[PDB]
């Protein structure tokens, strides 16, 4: 068991094509445009186009979670779900899914489908970095150290963490591979069982010195707009950087595989000007 897992990591050293193999083997049921897969990877450690099914992977892997949607789930489903016990005739301070969603991955569908009157509760959480409790007698905050991933279309556009646009490449050959993929398909268990738990037990990333100046290179190119560093995405960027530390077991992060995330935001950003 102990010696067997060790031989697994050393075996990849001989193979020179491990750079693409590790990404391709994990979550193969995800469609093309694998920039989402990288985003899923960061989170891991025509609506419903492989998107509703995407929620299955997280829900299957971590059983602790809940599904919610707009116009179909009321405000009681996340919080303020106070109700009486009919057998004992006494009030209960029920909570909801968001409250128990701390230390986990949050699954919310149809994020933009919420009305303008509602959606109030998340707006504070995304801007207060915590989940506050609004009850009868008790006002407090539960830590909400998690991330939000979705896709959608008064100066409050800043609330969203990530915005993506899906374009049609007008390529049928992309569809062909998935069609064959279902028929064609019809060691991994050990990775899911012990590797995930054991690494999370004591392994704790540390911020090295070499990655400090790397963030500086981001806003330098950005100085051309209006003629940056005031956007808080820089702070968000280093947050995600902890993912690169898990890969290749390197505690330092370089510009490679980090500048690529900038283009993902640039594509969605550029279409907003004309």
């Amino acid at each position: 068991f102990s010696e067997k897992r060790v031989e697994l990591l050393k075996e990849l050293s001989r193979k020179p094509d491990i750079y693409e193999r590790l990404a391709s083997a994990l979550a193969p049921s995800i469609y093309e445009h694998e920039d989402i897969k990288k985003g899923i990877l960061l989170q891991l450690f025509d609506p419903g186009t492989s998107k509703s099914q995407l929620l299955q992977y997280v829900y299957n892997l971590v059983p602790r979670g809940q599904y919610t949607s707009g116009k179909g789930s009321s405000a009681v489903g996340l919080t303020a779900y106070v109700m009486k016990d009919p057998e004992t005739r006494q009030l209960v301070l029920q909570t909801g899914a968001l409250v128990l969603s701390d230390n986990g991955i949050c699954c919310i569908d149809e994020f933009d489908k919420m009305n303008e009157s509602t959606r109030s509760v998340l707006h504070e959480v995304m801007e207060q970095q915590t989940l506050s409790i609004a009850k009868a007698g008790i006002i407090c905050q539960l830590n909400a150290r998690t991330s939000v991933l979705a896709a959608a279309n008064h100066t409050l556009l800043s609330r969203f963490d990530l915005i993506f646009l899906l374009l049609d490449p007008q390529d049928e050959a992309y569809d062909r591979r998935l069609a064959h993929h279902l028929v064609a398909l019809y060691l991994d268990m050990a990775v899911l069982k012990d590797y995930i738990a054991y690494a999370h037990s004591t392994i704790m990333p540390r911020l090295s010195e070499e990655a400090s100046q790397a963030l500086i290179e981001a806003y330098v190119d950005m100085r051309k707009i209006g003629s940056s560093a005031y956007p808080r995405q820089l702070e968000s960027l280093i947050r995600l950087a902890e993912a690169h530390a898990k890969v290749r077991l390197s505690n330092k992060v370089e510009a490679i595989d980090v500048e690529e995330a900038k283009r993902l935001h640039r594509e969605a950003l550029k279409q907003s000007a004309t």
Binding site: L91, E124, G137, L142
Partner: protein, 548 residues
């Protein structure tokens, strides 16, 4: 054997009404009587050191039998007059002891600990109106039996089951013992545990505390006080009712009532206070993420300092709060991170802006036999007492927020009135707010109307104003991000903490009874100079807000 202890406690308290200290005689007793009767304030205290030296077991007897000493101390204590003349004049009152030196956490106050006492500590939530609800009495007809001097006591109804008259429901009756009854009051107050003493995820449990009329509004609501056989019938007669058991038995039932040490503290704190220019040290340490804008950071830093003059010459209410207006971002990549800096301050309560349940402003009757969804609490400011107020989403002042905020600003209280409730409070704390424009400061060529994007009645009362013009200066923006990443480099660069900086605030606490009596000569010199300040404003300086 309750009788002997019930007599001896009364004896050892009554003979104690004369002190050996404070001269001798009835002078102190006369002063206590004057303070009790003439203003009807009903405030008395007993020194526990003398109590213990006399009979330390006395504090233990009361501690283990408050439930037994309440009813006898209710009546026999009336004998302070030592004359039959004054006993009919006074109808009823209550006094007690104060400054109890042993306390326990509220959450741990288990039912296994009934009979103790603790400090009334926390914030009032879900206030309740005063009622003289049922206490003791009888329902039986006088023609069948006379009123007994031992019945009910608790909220339950009559225990005796003699003269089975009211068992049938086909009879209306209203004979109420209104002439001879002990109807006064009992009120539920949902006191919440102190958050500071509580950890992050707490969800406090609010006890069932009952406060007497004398306890009604005796302090500022929402705050801690910090200064043969017949009929051939055999045994087995059934007929018990279960309707009166699920209500009170399921809740907690108790009653509530409202030197080298200083020198050692004075030595360490006062000497270190002599360090000059500590505020300069704060700017780098307390504001790690500011570049330039030395005047902007200064106003906030000074805003931390307190000191509000009260009304001692019986004049008008001076306003002492601080309302600061900051010009900043065009509301894009909000500098609102500065709010997070405010979080680094103890002995304060952190407002979560305005997006909340908002239990106030839609208050309604709270007696729906178990509870009400809405509670009687304008926490929008009340919760922010004795701390800092932070309002986010300030663009949410369309209708409901506008009315509330001005009234709070104007009177420093909230007069909630729903035809059943009407009261005023004292919310002495700063209000920290910042509003962002649509896209920036451009009134040079564009009309100010509809441009500044604020509301007049709120912006007008703001104490301070600023002018912040942002320019695309690459010279300073280049090194802006260098300091930002420095926050994560604690290993090689950290400011060593030698002493706590919070001691300064506790200095202002003693300042309340002390009088500063600032000299008038220093004061007016600025005032005379201030005339030049207002005159130069009208000579053609750049305009930002016509308030001056």
């Amino acid at each position: 054997v309750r009788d002997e202890v019930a007599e001896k406690c009364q004896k050892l308290f009554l003979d104690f009404l004369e002190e050996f200290q404070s001269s001798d005689g009835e002078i102190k007793y006369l002063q206590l009587a004057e303070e009790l009767i003439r203003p009807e304030r009903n405030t008395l205290v007993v020194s526990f050191v003398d109590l213990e030296q006399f009979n330390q077991q006395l504090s233990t007897t009361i501690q283990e039998e408050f439930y037994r000493v309440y009813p006898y101390l209710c009546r026999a204590l009336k004998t302070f007059v030592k004359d039959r003349k004054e006993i009919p004049l006074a109808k009823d009152f209550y006094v007690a002891f104060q400054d109890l030196p042993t306390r326990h956490k509220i959450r741990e106050l288990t039912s296994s600990r009934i009979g103790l006492l603790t400090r009334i500590s926390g914030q009032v939530v879900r206030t309740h109106p005063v009622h003289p609800e049922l206490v003791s009495g009888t329902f039986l007809c006088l023609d069948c039996q006379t009123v007994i001097r031992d019945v009910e006591q608790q909220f339950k109804y009559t225990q005796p089951n003699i003269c089975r008259n009211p068992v049938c429901a086909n009879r209306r009756r209203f004979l109420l013992d209104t002439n001879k009854s002990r109807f006064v009051d009992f009120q539920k107050v949902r006191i919440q545990e102190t958050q500071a003493e509580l950890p992050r995820g707490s969800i406090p449990r609010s006890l069932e505390v009952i406060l007497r009329a004398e306890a009604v509004e005796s302090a500022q609501a929402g705050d801690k006080c910090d200064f043969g056989v017949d009929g051939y019938e055999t045994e087995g007669i059934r007929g018990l009712r279960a309707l009166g058991v699920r209500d009170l038995s399921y809740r907690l039932v108790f009653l509530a009532c409202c030197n080298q040490m200083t020198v050692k503290e004075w030595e360490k704190v006062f000497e270190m206070s002599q360090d000059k220019n500590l505020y300069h040290n704060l700017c780098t340490s307390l504001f790690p993420t500011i570049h330039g804008n030395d005047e902007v950071k200064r106003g906030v830093l000074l805003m931390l300092f307190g000191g509000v003059p009260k009304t001692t010459g019986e004049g008008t209410s001076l306003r002492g709060d601080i309302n600061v207006c900051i010009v900043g971002d065009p509301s894009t990549a909000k500098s609102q991170f500065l709010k997070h800096v405010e979080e680094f301050s103890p002995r304060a309560v952190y407002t979560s802006g305005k997006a909340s349940s908002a239990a106030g402003l839609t208050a309604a009757v709270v007696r729906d036999e178990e509870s009400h969804e809405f509670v009687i609490e304008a926490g929008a400011l009340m919760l922010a007492d004795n701390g800092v107020c932070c309002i986010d989403e300030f663009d949410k002042m369309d209708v409901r927020d506008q009315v509330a905020i001005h009234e709070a600003m104007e009177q420093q209280t909230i007069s909630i009135t729903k035809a059943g409730v009407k009261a005023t409070l004292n919310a002495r704390t700063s209000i920290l707010a910042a509003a962002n424009p649509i896209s920036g400061h451009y009134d040079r060529s564009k009309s100010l109307k509809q441009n500044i994007n604020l509301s007049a009645p709120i912006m007008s009362r703001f104490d301070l104003f600023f002018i912040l013009v942002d320019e695309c200066n690459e010279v300073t923006d280049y090194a802006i991000a260098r300091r930002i990443v420095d926050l994560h480099s604690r290993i090689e660069e950290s400011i060593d903490r030698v002493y706590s900086l919070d001691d300064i605030r506790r200095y202002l606490l003693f300042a309340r009874q002390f009088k500063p009596k600032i000299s008038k000569e220093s004061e007016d010199f600025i005032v005379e100079q201030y005339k030049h300040l207002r005159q130069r404003d009208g000579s053609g300086v750049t305009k930002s807000s016509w308030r001056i």
